[PDB]
Design a protein around this ligand. Structure first.
Ligand SMILES: OC[C@H]1O[C@@H](O[C@@H]2[C@@H](O)[C@H](O[C@@H]3[C@@H](O)[C@H](O[C@@H]4[C@@H](O)[C@H](O[C@@H]5[C@@H](O)[C@H](O)O[C@H](CO)[C@H]5O)O[C@H](CO)[C@H]4O)O[C@H](CO)[C@H]3O)O[C@H](CO)[C@H]2O)[C@H](O)[C@@H](O)[C@@H]1O
Ligand SMILES: OC[C@H]1O[C@@H](O[C@@H]2[C@@H](O)[C@H](O[C@@H]3[C@@H](O)[C@H](O[C@@H]4[C@@H](O)[C@H](O[C@@H]5[C@@H](O)[C@H](O)O[C@H](CO)[C@H]5O)O[C@H](CO)[C@H]4O)O[C@H](CO)[C@H]3O)O[C@H](CO)[C@H]2O)[C@H](O)[C@@H](O)[C@@H]1O
Length: 752
């Protein structure tokens, strides 16, 4: 009737009567709701609706908000599609010293509007089709329709008309510098170079005026890299090849660690003989990892400047990138030079900790904390305490993973519900608009997966599908489904072309979509790798490896700019806290101080956090910048996270800071995160820093032929760590020739 059983658990299929717990706060109450009833999609778009996309505002707003199909910005309006390009004169870098914020952004302008000869009063714009990274938007007014196909990484906008023809409208007359009849090269008054393409024989009119017109029912617009007729000619070759399908297909080669992704379009010809291909604009995270076999397709001098640095052109049907998956661990092992009794004391202190709210996020942070403590308790010989922590995880998960109470009725809180309208699992109590905007399902549910993975590491029976595994697998499907999932859209959170996850379900902002904590995304991917390995689910594991590895490539470019190529020279900080489609901010979604605008991209610390140490010069540069701004090592908040980060390159410094301040205050206090951030513990902090002191630096130059491992290097001496989730012993080969044997359900070293 009102819930569906899944193993021992269930999810609600009717919206529950929420138990507000007597809380009257309207913000809290408004969070316990559902996403919008109205979805702006045509009847060609059926099944679970895609969310968390760069283009999402088209589906939620009657028209759209401003979007960033780089290299363009566009927005839908009743009058037509506005097109813009941020030139250098449009870009700014601003600091608000009092707020401690910085902002890199452009403008919300209009270079021209793509219009329909029959109407400038469209009723709405709907999603009419989409694929892995393009969308087809359909402006509708009865018989008058204008379908616009565009995408991130497409320097084309394809325009198809019904019951009318093409118009390009400008506020100031453009310079048409090349007039080939059906093809024109033009510039805005402020020298932005574009081109427009119609079928042969359909000639452009209005040249020299503010309005360029064409009788064709098909045109394409291109952003040109330069005012160059040879480039115009190249763009003409693919201007009639409209992208209909676009897939990012991947493989993981376990032996080598290589994740290979092939981006492939399928086009429809708008003139006879049009080739099956396009011109792609690649982002830095792509072209820096371009496969050898794709290099011949590069259009070398075809560059575009955007918020994310320089894009480059590449022609054809497909291209391929190659990345290296570095491994993850379930925990750091027991290899530190800590006082073990001191660590035991901290493990017991952590029983005083409790969740600071009833919503999925705060509960998530608490269950991640317990799951992090349990392996450390095992290591220290506090085996009943470890069991206490895992028992508490079981109690919490077995509660949340059941939608019905003892009577068989729906619960009012601590449950999951399937919103059928969009096709998404929502958890109540909700927060951060996880339900009302379909936000942050990776951030929140990643913590539930961590809890499950720690349980599964000790208890395979609990994790079976028919027990509690089916419900965990349902949560994972919500945020990272494979194709043809009957309940959920494909890879909800992830944008395979932009290379990152997008946190906002709706994307109804004029900067496009955003992501703040890239580290909470990486945490989700880590935990699925661990869960899938524990439960023997190779396909799921490999999908999470692809996500972890790809997201890592985007983080190092756009959040960290490890290569010192992307952020403008005048931008002071050494991190971007929030990446948007259209802008970059050193700022947080809540009111914070200096440390948090860095550390929200570090936390939480866990066995998959070692990607943060791959670039020791970056780690040093970022730490030194934050230290400069603070003016000392008196961290304003979350001191433990700064010490843990510092330990990637200078564990002696990290240790002395920790010794000086870690016991400044006593047991868990929600009002005071000066020393210990509320998702962290003293025990975790002390264990982490001492392990890094013994291990040295992360060594990303060595891979292995199994996925659960790490390699460190201290002055040329390597330490190899492997965790084996199997009932059988394994042998692991490392790429430097080293081999080890690992016993069932253990680390090779430091089991403790
Ligand atoms: O130390 C005491 C203080 O601790 C703070 O908790 C921190 C916590 O807020 C932080 O959360 C992260 C979230 O920012 C992030 O979630 C984002 C949403 O918050 C955001 O919502 C916006 C909304 O702010 C705005 O008003 O309206 C928008 C719609 O118009 C709406 O979208 O949306 C983002 C996506 O667009 C979304 O990602 O993600 C995670 C939570 O889901 C968190 O990473 O996390 C910190 C670290 O755990 C916390 O310390 C409290 O907030 C303060 O009140 C306390 O005083
Ligand atoms: O200082 C003490 C108080 O601090 C507060 O925290 C501050 C925090 O709220 C602030 O969050 C920033 C967001 O406000 C910002 O959101 C922007 C959107 O508002 C904007 O929306 C527009 C919409 O206004 C317009 O009508 O329609 C447009 C669509 O057509 C729509 O886009 O969208 C922007 C993106 O397009 C969006 O950025 O987003 C920032 C990140 O980019 C947030 O940082 O941040 C401050 C700095 O960290 C915080 O100080 C607390 O909440 C208070 O309780 C304290 O009293």
């Amino acid at each position: 009737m009102h819930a569906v059983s899944v193993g021992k658990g269930s999810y609600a299929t009717e919206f529950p009567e929420i138990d507000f717990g007597g809380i009257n706060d309207p913000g809290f109450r408004d969070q316990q709701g559902e996403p919008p009833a109205t979805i702006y999609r045509s009847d060609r778009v059926t099944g679970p609706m895609q969310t968390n996309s760069w283009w999402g505002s088209l589906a939620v707003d009657r028209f759209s908000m401003n979007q960033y199909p780089h290299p363009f910005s566009v927005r839908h309006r009743a009058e037509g599609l506005h097109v813009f390009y941020d030139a250098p004169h449009n870009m700014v870098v601003h600091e608000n010293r009092e707020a401690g914020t910085w902002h890199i952004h452009g403008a919300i302008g209009t270079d021209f509007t793509i219009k329909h000869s029959g109407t400038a009063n469209f009723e709405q714009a709907v999603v009419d089709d989409y694929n892995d990274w393009y969308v087809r938007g359909l402006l509708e007014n009865g018989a008058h329709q204008m379908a616009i196909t565009y995408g991130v990484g497409s320097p084309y906008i394809f325009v198809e008309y019904e019951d009318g023809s093409a118009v390009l409208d400008f506020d100031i007359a453009p310079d048409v510098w090349e007039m080939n009849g059906h093809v024109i090269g033009f510039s805005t008054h402020d020298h932005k170079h574009y081109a427009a393409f119609a079928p042969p024989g359909q000639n452009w009119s209005g040249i020299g005026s503010k309005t360029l017109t064409n009788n064709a029912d098909y045109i394409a617009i291109a952003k040109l890299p330069e005012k160059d007729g040879n480039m115009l000619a190249k763009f003409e070759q693919y201007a009639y090849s409209v992208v209909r399908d676009a897939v990012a297909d991947w493989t993981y080669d376990e032996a080598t660690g290589t994740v290979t992704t092939t981006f492939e379009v399928t086009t429809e010809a708008k003139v006879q003989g049009a080739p099956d291909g396009t011109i792609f604009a690649l982002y830095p995270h792509q072209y820096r990892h371009l496969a050898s076999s794709s290099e011949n397709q590069l259009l070398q001098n075809y560059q575009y400047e955007i918020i994310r640095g320089t894009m480059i052109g590449l022609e054809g049907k497909r291209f391929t990138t190659e990345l290296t998956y570095p491994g993850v661990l379930p925990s750091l092992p027991d290899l530190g030079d800590y006082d073990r009794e001191r660590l035991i004391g901290y493990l017991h202190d952590a029983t005083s900790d409790y969740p600071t709210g009833s919503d999925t996020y705060e509960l998530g942070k608490y269950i991640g904390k317990l799951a992090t403590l349990a392996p450390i308790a095992d290591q220290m010989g506090e085996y009943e305490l470890a069991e206490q922590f895992r028992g508490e995880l079981k109690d919490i998960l077995e509660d949340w993973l059941q939608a019905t109470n003892a009577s068989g009725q729906l619960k009012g809180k601590n449950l999951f519900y399937y919103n059928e309208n969009w096709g998404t699992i929502l958890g109540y109590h909700a927060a951060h608009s996880s339900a009302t905007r379909i936000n942050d399902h990776h951030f929140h549910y990643g913590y539930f997966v961590k809890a499950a993975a720690e349980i599964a590491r000790a208890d395979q029976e609990w994790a079976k599908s028919e027990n509690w595994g089916g419900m965990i697998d349902l949560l994972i499907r919500d945020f990272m489904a494979d194709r043809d999932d009957d309940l959920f859209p494909y890879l909800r959170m992830f944008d395979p072309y932009s290379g990152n996850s997008w946190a906002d379900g709706l994307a109804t902002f004029d900067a496009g979509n955003n992501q703040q904590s890239s580290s909470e995304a990486m945490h989700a991917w880590t935990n699925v790798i661990l869960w899938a390995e524990a439960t023997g689910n190779k396909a799921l594991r490999d999908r999470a490896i692809y996500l972890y590895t790809t997201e890592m490539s985007a983080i190092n470019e756009y959040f960290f700019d490890v290569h010192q190529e992307i952020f403008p020279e005048e931008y002071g900080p050494e991190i971007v806290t929030i990446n948007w489609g259209g802008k970059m901010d050193h700022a947080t979604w809540w009111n914070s101080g200096k440390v948090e605008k860095y550390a929200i991209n570090w936390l939480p610390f866990h066995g998959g956090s070692l990607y943060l140490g791959h670039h020791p010069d970056y780690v040093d540069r970022a730490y030194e910048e934050l230290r400069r701004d603070i003016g000392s090592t008196d961290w304003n908040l979350w001191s433990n996270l700064v010490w843990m980060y510092r330990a990637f390159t200078n564990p002696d410094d990290a240790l002395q800071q920790m010794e000086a301040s870690i016991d400044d205050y006593g047991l868990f206090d929600p009002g005071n995160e000066k020393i210990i951030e509320r998702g962290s513990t003293k025990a975790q902090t002390y264990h982490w820093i001492h392990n890094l002191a013994e291990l040295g630096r992360v060594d990303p130059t060595v891979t292995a032929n199994h996925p659960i491992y790490a390699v460190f290097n201290k002055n040329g001496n390597r330490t190899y760590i492997v965790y084996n989730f199997s009932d059988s012993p394994i042998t692991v080969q490392f790429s430097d020739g080293h081999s080890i044997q690992v016993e069932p359900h253990s680390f090779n070293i430091g089991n403790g």
